[PDB]
DNA sequence: TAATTGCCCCCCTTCGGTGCTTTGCACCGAAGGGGGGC
């Protein structure tokens, strides 16, 4: 398939980050399996691009796995069930080994040079460029996808029942059957796949905004109340706070107990019957991006809102650790990302655009040892600390 | 010349090749320039050009390391412009603190890198240049490149992976052999007997030279100390070949520069450098020619380094069976020092942060930031991450890490008790305190005529307005802030319709580019319980909007 | 005004772009200077 860029667009140029020993090791030796069967081959500095390439250990599995990050090359190259949210158990399978058996075409190949580092900068760093199609790509899966299809074909109408949809590298495949039952469907599916060559998305609530209750409001939690309120008029309009404002009226202490007059509490009890439902007009665009903010709440809880358009979110979660131990932040916010992106693919079949709460540096740094997927979200990184936890 | 292969080099898409002429040039040059063109021709590595090449590009001659020696270079600045885009493989600095103990080494050099690899014949035409004739008269004589050109853009990349194509066969085939290769240089490290090293030596001669690439015995080093890389290698130490401080009366801008990255190279063997005075000196300076007097700041600074680099330091080789540390230690200022070492007091690397990132930052932010640096270096030269001795308590580091909104981490690390610690100095009461007196403070300023007022109108009666000339809206706010602290008691609850001054003061800064936020800083300190609440500014919330008036 | 070059890593300062709500302020990356290497 004769792939080009987008019009008017160069190519990647990412610089490669440094390495530790044993990602190093690991990749010289996949790299060096990978050429000996001509899946990628050497190239020189004349080739002008770059991709960042690193590795990880999958789930529980002992082998590591190379990943490039493509996500340059995905922006400039020019090339969804909505049942799958509502299945009961969803498998997510790694396809990308199939990729290295269809070519990728000549012109194109150049675009996918990566540079694999050295130890204490031993060596100049050795590059290498892809002949066949790459994993991480998304002109992998538009030029499998007739392979693909005809693989599926004989499963999908003997199994009509099971959704199987496909982003990147994985299949998700997914059905109302017996978790049993479902393990044996994977079997099946596995070889399938062989011979031809855990979610559960019916759990996802949605975080609401709950208004605090209690028996006694002083002046400071009628502020932070009147505060939240404020805050969340942009998010429900028609939402009121006029009887509560009048009762912070004058210069009173913060620890003052002022009584709920009738008007505030008929008010309040509107107020929290308005945040309870949900909010009404908000429509998936496919053309628009999506964004996804993470906020962090202490005690190994973290909340988070995917929206399309500012203060009109589409979905609101909370992933929580629970503490457990489990000391190191920036691994939570790793694996917070994973399985916000791996709902947002669920639900509407994009990435999200990622804001993170981190240090660029420490993002930068520590994401890739504790990462486990086969894609790589676009993120950017907010340095404005959220004013009150309003989604808590 | 070599029977490597030539990279295929292009010029960028509708661009021609440079037709700049020839600037004139000094006896003693054009001398050197036409004996190392006739030396040049006769091996074939340029070629006598005539008017079928319309093109030109001035050529000059520097002194290498080893002087009574000439380096043709060419300013190659247009075709540079021109030529198209490499991507470049070296990718960073080898460092003699990542090498292991061998039992004998080896540093060679190679006669003439770029010169013995042919460049693309297509591109040749483009390296056209004319060495003028002494004084005038006569024309110069016309040539072109057969070989990589010292001041082309494509020639270091191309020499670099045409260097590791050649050494790829015999370091396969000797997997035992380290070897270090930056350009044209090559650390062979092995723990054979110096008879088998020599003989491998030899071996690794004879394979270059096979590729054309001649190994003069001048630059081959077979006893230590070997000189690599600017350092000096012992069998069991290293040491940075020896730095000349500037000895001025009277500093200039390019002086104190010059100084500061002296020192900046210096302090990665030598411990607590410091350089923070003396780049204090180039802010606002114009002139690479002003005399920057010293500020008696840069003075003691100056004489601290001096004193550190008076007595010889040396670093140890990697032992890769034991463990890396890395110890911090503060120094004021925003200033860090640390060293890597595997065994007590021998040290492998030593380093500094002195990194000033935001407007408002407190200690806690700046170690964590050393510590990313930290890792990301002995990454870089070693491969793994250090375990690192902070003098932070363990305590203060799970105190900000649960309070903070974003995520931050530290690897695997250890308290140790050095007394210049690392401590949040004051923190923000989670819940409003009672009996505490409360104020309610806002600050407006009219964004027309650069002038405003703030208050911090008090629920017992007192209340205070301050006029703020030439003030913005936000410092308004800030001063509000400080108003409330400066008329208050020990003990004080705080409400404003401020974010901005809510964001700056509950990251719990210490340190400040504003004066007045160091000020505020200073009135927290003093305090004891300090309650922050905001409040939204026009919804009637009484209080910030019962007297807001008397500052709007 | 001189001396005129190229690539790589680092630090320190300056300036323009971007974002967000608060058109001021904070942050970041590129480019200038310097150091080191070849
Ligand atoms: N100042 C410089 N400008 C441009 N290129 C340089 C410079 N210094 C070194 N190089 C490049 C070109 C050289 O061929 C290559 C190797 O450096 P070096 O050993 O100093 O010189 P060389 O190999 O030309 O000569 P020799 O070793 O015979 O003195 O690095
Ligand atoms: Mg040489
Ligand atoms: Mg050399």
Request: hydrophobic letters at 35%; glycine letters at 6%.
């Amino acid at each position: 398939v004769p792939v080009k860029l987008k019009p008017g667009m160069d190519g990647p140029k990412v610089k490669q980050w440094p390495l530790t020993e044993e990602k190093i090791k690991a990749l010289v030796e996949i790299c060096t399996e990978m050429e000996k069967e001509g899946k990628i081959s050497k190239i020189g500095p004349e080739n002008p691009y770059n991709t960042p390439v690193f590795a990880i250990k999958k789930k529980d599995s002992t082998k590591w796995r190379k990943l490039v990050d493509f996500r340059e090359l995905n922006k400039r190259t020019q090339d969804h069930p909505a049942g799958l949210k509502k299945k009961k158990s969803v498998t997510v399978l790694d396809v990308g080994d199939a990729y290295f058996s269809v070519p990728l075409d000549e012109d194109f190949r150049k675009y996918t040079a990566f540079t694999i580092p050295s130890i204490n900068n031993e060596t100049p760093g050795i590059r290498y460029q892809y002949n066949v199609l790459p994993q991480g790509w998304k002109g992998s899966p538009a030029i499998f996808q007739s392979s693909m299809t005809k693989i599926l074909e004989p499963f999908k109408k003997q199994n009509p029942d099971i959704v199987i949809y496909q982003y990147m590298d994985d299949l998700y495949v997914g059905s109302d059957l017996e978790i049993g039952q479902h393990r044996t469907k994977i079997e099946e599916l596995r070889q399938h796949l062989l011979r031809w060559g855990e979610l559960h998305p019916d759990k996802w609530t949605v975080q609401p905004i709950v208004l605090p209750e209690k028996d006694s409001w002083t002046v400071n939690d009628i502020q932070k109340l009147v505060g939240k309120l404020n805050w969340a008029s942009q998010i429900y309009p028609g939402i009121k706070v006029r009887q509560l404002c009048k009762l912070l009226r004058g210069t009173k202490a913060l620890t003052e107990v002022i009584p709920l007059t009738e008007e505030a509490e008929l008010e309040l009890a509107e107020n929290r019957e308005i945040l309870k439902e949900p909010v009404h007009g908000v429509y998936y665009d496919p053309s628009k991006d999506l964004i996804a903010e993470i906020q962090k709440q202490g005690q190994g809880q973290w909340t988070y809102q995917i929206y399309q358009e500012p203060f009109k979110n589409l979905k609101t979660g909370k992933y929580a650790r629970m503490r457990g131990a489990h000391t190191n932040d920036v691994k939570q916010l790793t694996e917070a990302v994973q399985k916000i992106t791996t709902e947002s693919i669920v639900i509407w079949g994009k990435t999200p655009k990622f804001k993170l709460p981190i240090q660029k540096e420490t993002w930068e740094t520590w994401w890739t040892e504790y990462w486990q997927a086969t894609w790589i979200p676009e993120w950017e990184f907010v340095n404005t600390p959220p004013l009150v936890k309003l989604w808590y | 010349i070599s029977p490597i292969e030539t990279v295929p080099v292009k010029l960028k898409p509708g661009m021609d090749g440079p037709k700049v002429k020839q600037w004139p040039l000094t006896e003693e040059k054009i001398k050197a320039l036409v004996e190392i063109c006739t030396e040049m021709e006769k091996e074939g590595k340029i070629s006598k050009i005539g008017p079928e090449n319309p093109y030109n590009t001035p050529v000059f001659a520097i002194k290498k390391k080893d002087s009574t020696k000439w380096r043709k270079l060419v300013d190659f600045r247009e075709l540079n412009k021109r030529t198209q885009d490499f991507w470049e493989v070296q990718l960073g600095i080898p460092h003699p603190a990542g090498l292991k103990k061998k039992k004998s080494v080896t540093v060679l050099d190679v006669g003439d890198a770029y010169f013995s690899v042919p460049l693309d014949e297509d591109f040749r035409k483009y390296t056209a240049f004319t060495i003028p004739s002494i004084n005038n008269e006569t024309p110069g004589i016309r040539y072109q490149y057969n070989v990589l050109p010292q001041g082309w853009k494509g020639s270091p990349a191309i020499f670099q992976s045409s260097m590791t194509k050649i050494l790829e066969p015999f370091k396969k085939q000797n997997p035992d052999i380290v070897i270090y290769q930056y350009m044209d240089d090559l650390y062979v490290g092995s723990d054979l007997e110096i008879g088998q090293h020599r003989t491998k030596i030899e071996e690794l001669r004879q394979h270059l030279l096979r590729w054309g690439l001649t190994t003069p015995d001048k630059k081959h080093q077979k006893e230590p100390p070997f000189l690599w890389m600017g350092y000096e290698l012992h069998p069991d130490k290293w040491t940075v070949q020896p730095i000349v401080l500037p000895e001025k009366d009277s500093w200039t801008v390019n002086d104190i520069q010059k100084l500061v990255g002296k020192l900046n190279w210096a302090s990665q063997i030598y411990p607590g450098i410091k350089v923070r005075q003396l780049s204090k000196l180039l802010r606002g300076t114009k002139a690479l020619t002003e005399v920057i007097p010293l500020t008696e700041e840069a003075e003691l600074e100056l004489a601290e380094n001096r004193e550190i680099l008076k007595e010889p330091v040396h670093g140890v080789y990697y032992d890769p069976s034991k463990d890396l540390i890395a110890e911090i230690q503060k120094q004021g200022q925003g200033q860090w020092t640390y060293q890597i070492y595997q065994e007590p007091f021998k040290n492998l690397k030593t380093g500094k942060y002195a990194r000033m990132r935001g407007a408002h930052t407190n200690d806690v932010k700046q170690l964590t930031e050393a510590v990313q640096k930290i890792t990301t270096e002995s990454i870089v030269i070693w491969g793994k991450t250090p375990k690192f001795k902070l003098p932070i308590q363990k305590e203060t580091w799970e105190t900000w890490w649960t309070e903070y909104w974003q995520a931050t981490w530290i690897p695997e690390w250890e308290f140790v008790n050095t007394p210049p610690l690392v401590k949040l100095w004051y923190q923000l009461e989670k819940e409003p305190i009672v009996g505490a007196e409360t104020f309610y403070v806002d600050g407006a300023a009219n964004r027309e005529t650069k002038l405003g007022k703030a208050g911090y109108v008090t629920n017992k009666g007192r209340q205070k307005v301050v006029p703020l000339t030439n003030t913005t809206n936000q410092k308004t706010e800030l001063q509000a802030i400080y108003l409330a602290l400066q008329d208050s008691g020990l003990e004080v609850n705080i409400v404003t319709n401020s974010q901005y001054a809510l964001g700056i003061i509950q990251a719990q800064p210490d340190k400040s580019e504003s004066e007045l936020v160091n000020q505020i800083i200073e009135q927290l300190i003093k305090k004891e319980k300090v309650y922050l609440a905001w409040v939204p500014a026009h919804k009637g919330i009484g209080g910030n909007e019962q007297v807001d008036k008397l500052v709007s």
